[PDB]
Design an enzyme around this catalytic site. Structure first.
Site, short mmCIF file in Angstrom:
data_model
loop_
_atom_site.label_atom_id
_atom_site.label_comp_id
_atom_site.label_asym_id
_atom_site.label_seq_id
_atom_site.Cartn_x
_atom_site.Cartn_y
_atom_site.Cartn_z
CB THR A 138 -0.23 11.59 2.67
OG1 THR A 138 -0.63 11.25 3.99
CG2 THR A 138 -1.47 11.78 1.82
N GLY A 141 0.79 -1.21 0.00
CA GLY A 141 0.00 0.00 0.00
C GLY A 141 0.83 1.26 0.00
CD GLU A 142 1.45 5.25 -3.88
OE1 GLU A 142 0.33 5.40 -4.42
OE2 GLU A 142 2.51 5.17 -4.53
CG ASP A 170 -6.51 8.58 12.71
OD1 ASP A 170 -7.69 8.87 12.40
OD2 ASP A 170 -5.60 8.52 11.87
NE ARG A 210 4.74 4.22 -3.42
CZ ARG A 210 5.56 5.09 -3.99
NH1 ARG A 210 6.84 5.13 -3.65
NH2 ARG A 210 5.10 5.91 -4.93
CE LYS A 269 3.34 3.49 8.92
NZ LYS A 269 3.07 4.06 10.27
O1 LIG Z 1 0.84 1.99 10.08
C1 LIG Z 1 0.84 0.86 10.56
O2 LIG Z 1 0.90 0.69 11.88
C2 LIG Z 1 0.71 -0.36 9.68
C3 LIG Z 1 1.13 -1.61 10.16
C4 LIG Z 1 1.00 -2.74 9.35
C5 LIG Z 1 0.43 -2.67 8.05
C6 LIG Z 1 0.00 -1.40 7.60
C7 LIG Z 1 0.15 -0.27 8.40
N1 LIG Z 1 -0.56 -1.23 6.36
C8 LIG Z 1 -0.73 -2.28 5.51
N2 LIG Z 1 -1.31 -2.09 4.28
C9 LIG Z 1 -1.59 -0.90 3.68
C10 LIG Z 1 -2.77 -0.76 2.93
C11 LIG Z 1 -3.09 0.45 2.30
C12 LIG Z 1 -2.21 1.53 2.40
C13 LIG Z 1 -1.03 1.39 3.14
CL1 LIG Z 1 0.10 2.72 3.28
C14 LIG Z 1 -0.72 0.19 3.77
C15 LIG Z 1 -0.32 -3.57 5.91
C16 LIG Z 1 -0.49 -4.67 5.06
C17 LIG Z 1 -0.08 -5.94 5.47
N3 LIG Z 1 0.47 -6.12 6.69
C18 LIG Z 1 0.64 -5.08 7.54
C19 LIG Z 1 0.27 -3.77 7.19
#
Ligand SMILES: O=C(O)c1ccc2c(c1)nc(Nc1cccc(Cl)c1)c1ccncc12
Length: 340
Positions: free
Chosen positions: A30, A27-28, A147, A33, A50
């Site tokens: 602001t 994912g991505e 949030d 990624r 991240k």
């Molecule tokens: O911020 C965290 O704590 C955080 C922690 C873990 C994940 C995450 C964000 N975002 C994920 N996916 C994702 C989906 C859409 C947009 C973005 Cl930037 C990220 C993701 C996917 C698979 N496993 C763990 C994560």
């Protein structure tokens, strides 16, 4: 190699820190990624890395996030409390990188992929229970997430099966396992720490936050109420980007704002003669009347378990933060009785 906007440029198969091999992009956003990597210093385990942009303010924000994540790990050595696990973090040439456990799709993305068809009530029950447990752990440790929203709650594994909904005459995607984790601690605040004045994404924002009355743990409970409702009906409870309209929506759904909160707020432009300054007979007022209604009117079944869910939601959406259900109390709600 950074792009014009501060993102790290990478290609599949690149290694970072002679350790993380990039497999795909998850994912991505602001801030940066998230990329799926093989961690070669952890036996080849897959991780979600991240990669924060090379932006000074985001870097500083990530350090605070890391401190919360470190506190979480410390207080949860057996990984019992349903908050995301950070495995590692490093500064990669200005890009803060945080290695997380690999999870599946967010509850929002799963809902979206399912044409916004709501979660069935037994799934809402388990998801809501876990959400309450995870945030109770935070509240027990002098933290407020601030949030909470469906995008920040991910399924551990979002594999699904097609089920048929006879009432709706449509196929529905049914997640095989409703295990979830709360993620994104970038906004999480310790009791002793400087509090931002405005917190939470608009739709999930508590009235004490809007009215600048001060906020703490209870503002998370409001967000949770909003999230549980969204799981059950499939659309957001408060669809607005205007304070006064938001307040009018609260009044239509929940009844009048308590006079003490009106008396106490500095936000006196929203109020006239001691009550909300809103004219229901304008087109703005017509919109609110047509696009929302008293909370219990959203029930889709008269069966007792549905009423029990709305008892919980209603208690979570208590206007006064000090009167609002705590998460310790929520975990004991009759709605949860059917769960193992
Ligand atoms: O911020 C965290 O704590 C955080 C922690 C873990 C994940 C995450 C964000 N975002 C994920 N996916 C994702 C989906 C859409 C947009 C973005 Cl930037 C990220 C993701 C996917 C698979 N496993 C763990 C994560």
């Amino acid at each position: 190699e950074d792009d014009a906007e501060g993102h790290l440029i990478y290609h599949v198969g690149d290694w970072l820190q002679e350790r993380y091999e990039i497999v795909s992009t998850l994912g991505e956003g602001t801030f940066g990624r998230v990329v799926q990597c093989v961690d070669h210093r952890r036996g080849g385990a897959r991780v979600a890395l991240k990669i924060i942009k090379n932006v000074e303010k985001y870097k500083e924000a990530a350090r605070l996030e890391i401190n919360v994540l470190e506190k979480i790990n410390e207080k949860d050595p057996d990984n019992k409390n349903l908050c995301v696990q950070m495995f590692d973090w490093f500064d990669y040439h200005g890009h803060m990188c945080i290695s997380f456990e690999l999870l599946g799709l967010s509850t929002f993305d799963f809902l979206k992929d399912n044409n916004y068809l709501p979660y069935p009530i037994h799934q809402v029950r388990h998801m809501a229970f876990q959400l309450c447990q995870a945030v109770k752990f935070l509240h027990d440790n002098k933290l407020t997430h601030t949030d909470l929203k469906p995008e920040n709650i991910l399924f551990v594994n979002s594999d699904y099966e097609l089920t048929y909904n006879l009432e709706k005459k449509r196929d529905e995607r049914s997640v095989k396992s409703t295990a979830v984790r709360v993620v994104d601690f970038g906004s999480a605040t310790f009791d002793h720490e400087h509090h931002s004045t405005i917190v939470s994404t608009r739709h999930y924002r508590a009235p004490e936050v809007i009215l600048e009355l001060g906020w703490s743990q209870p503002c998370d409970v409001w967000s949770i109420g909003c999230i549980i409702f969204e799981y059950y009906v499939g659309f957001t409870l408060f669809q607005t980007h205007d304070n006064r309209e938001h307040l009018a929506m609260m009044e239509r759904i929940l009844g009048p704002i308590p006079s003490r909160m009106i008396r106490k707020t500095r936000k006196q432009k929203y109020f006239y003669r001691g009550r909300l300054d809103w004219d229901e007979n304008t087109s703005a007022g017509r919109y609110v009347r047509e696009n929302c209604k008293p909370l219990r009117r959203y029930l889709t079944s008269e069966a007792e378990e549905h009423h029990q869910l709305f008892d919980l939601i209603e208690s979570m959406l208590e206007y006064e933060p000090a009167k609002r259900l705590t998460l310790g109390e929520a975990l004991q709600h009759p709605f949860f009785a059917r769960l193992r």
